[PDB]
Amino acid sequence: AVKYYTLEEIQKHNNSKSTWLILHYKVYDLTKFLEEHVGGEEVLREQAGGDATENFEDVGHSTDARELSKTFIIGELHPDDR
Numbered sequence: 001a002v003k004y005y006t007l008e009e010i011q012k013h014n015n016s017k018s019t020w021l022i023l024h025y026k027v028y029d030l031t032k033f034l035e036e037h038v039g040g041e042e043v044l045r046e047q048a049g050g051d052a053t054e055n056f057e058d059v060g061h062s063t064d065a066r067e068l069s070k071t072f073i074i075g076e077l078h079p080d081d082r
C-alpha cells in the first residue's frame with residue numbers, strides 16, 4: 001500500500017518536534033537524521049515542510065547517500081497536489 005500526503009499536511013511538519021520534506025514526490029521524515037547529516041542540519045531545517053528536490057540535486061548526492069535516504073520515506077505526495 002502507499003500513503004499519500006497533501007502539501008497542506010506536510011507544511012505543518014517544520015518545527016523542533018518534526019521535520020518533513022519532499023524529494024521527487026516522496027515524503028521523508030528527517031526528524032532524527034538532522035544531527036547525523038554530514039551536510040549539516042541548518043540546510044535541512046530551511047527546506048522543512050516543502051519540496052527540496054532541486055537543492056538536493058544541485059549538491060549532487062552520492063549513490064550511498066541516496067540509498068540511505070530511502071529508509072526515511074514515509075509516503076508520497078498526493079497526485080492532486082502534483
Ligand code: HEM
Pocket residue numbers: 021023028037038039040043044047052055056059060061062063064065066068069
Ligand atoms: C534525504 C536525506 C539526505 C541524506 C541521506 C543526505 C546525505 C548526505 C551525505 C551522506 C552527504 C555527504 C556527501 C554525499 O555522500 O553525497 C551529504 C552532504 C550534503 N547534503 Fe545531504 N542528504 C540528504 C538530504 C539533503 C538535502 C534535502 C539537502 C539540501 C536541502 C542536503 C544538502 C547537503 C549539503 C549542502 C551537503 C554538503 C555538500 C558539500 O560539502 O559540498 N542534503 N548529504
